[PDB]
Amino acid sequence: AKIDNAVLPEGSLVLVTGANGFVASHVVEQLLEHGYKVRGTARSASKLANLQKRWDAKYPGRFETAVVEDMLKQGAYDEVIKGAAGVAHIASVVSFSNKYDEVVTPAIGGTLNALRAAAATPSVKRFVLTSSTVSALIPKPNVEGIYLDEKSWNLESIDKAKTLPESDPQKSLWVYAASKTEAELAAWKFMDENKPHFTLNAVLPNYTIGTIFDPETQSGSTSGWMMSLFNGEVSPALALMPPQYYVSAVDIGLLHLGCLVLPQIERRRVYGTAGTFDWNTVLATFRKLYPSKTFPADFPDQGQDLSKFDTAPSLEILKSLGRPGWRSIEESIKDLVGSETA
């Protein structure tokens, strides 16, 4: 069909863990759009009601809500993974509670739990793990000589996370970074040690910008934070986020799709890094999209991201799916906040 030589047959069922999440909902949307059936998990059926409603109207009988309230529980995926040909693990831990052992352990645990379920389920042929650019690094404004490729690991986050004082403005970020880094490493180690019968790929998005399908419960996401600024809310938590790379929610969905069905994509770490930005380029875009609206004035210069990412597999995927190149930051932000029109 739309995708020639897709490793997963048309109409195949794909299990998407944590389908009510912001990023996950776009992965789900792209899969459904491409004719694949999806069974999305959430800690409760109610957390997926609004999205279920949306998908029932748009893709009649293609999406199914599945409940998994304890992603760490042994055998938690025994029933939901049944009949799945593909798996996109996007479910995340439940906290910003600093204790390294309390944040990192569950992260690794949830990842391996889903990986073992897939290894035990013969129907599963492809597995895509939603990681993050923090598994490679924490952004470093104005620093030259940074090039991230598939062999780049945020090794410094491990120590930084367990040594930095709680007074450090970024300790919370470092703990999160360590959790993502350790989890992805554990995922690749499991592939290397158990040699399961499925292909693994990982998508590493940076700052995802796009339409918030369900604002009711998705306002804490990256786009949720951006929408907050659009509404005039300025907070230290926001300014604490440095200049880095954005990526369209649409492209992130496409990248996951590619990792799930493209034959030429195997054992890759796919960077979701379209271009750089800072809060001032974001405000500039807001002003252009809504010329009559009042917005906060520019933030003090926060520097710029001078790093570069090896997006080879990413671009390969986008081209193969017929959506070459990254969607621009202006169109991405327009997806999120719309524009002054009538």
Resolution in A: 2.0
For the chain, the distance separating the N- and C-terminal CA atoms, rounded to the nearest angstrom, is: 37
Do 304 and 243 form a contact (C-beta atoms < 8 A)? yes
Domain-embedded: residue 181: yes
> How many domains does one find in the chain?
1
User: In sequence order, which residues have a C-beta less than 8 Å from that of residue 46 and are 6 or more positions away?
Assistant: none
Domain-embedded: residue 297: yes
Which CATH number belongs to the domain containing residue 38 in this structure?
3.40.50.720
CA 338 – CA 341 distance, rounded (Å): 9
Q: Which two tokens stand for residue 27?
A: 């992965």
Domain-embedded: residue 42: yes
Domain-embedded: residue 82: yes
- For the beta sheet containing 37-42, the strands, ordered from the edge strand earlier in sequence to the opposite edge, are 63-67, 37-42, 13-17, 86-89, 126-130, 199-205, 269-272
For 82-221, where are the E strands, in sequence order?
A: 86-89, 126-130, 147-148, 199-205, 207-209
Domain-embedded: residue 4: no
User: In sequence order, which residues have a C-beta less than 8 Å from that of residue 195 and are 6 or more positions away?
Assistant: none
Task: Confirm whether residue 176 is marked as ligand binding.
Answer: yes
Domain-embedded: residue 184: yes
Backbone torsions φ then ψ of 275, nearest 5 degrees: -165, 170
Q: How many CB atoms lie within 10 A of CB 40?
A: 30
Domain-embedded: residue 174: yes
Which residue range forms the structural domain that includes residue 189? 12-338
CA 252 – CA 335 distance, rounded (Å): 14
Domain-embedded: residue 38: yes
Q: How far is CA 132 from the centre of its chain?
A: 7
Q: Which two tokens stand for residue 144?
A: 């030259």
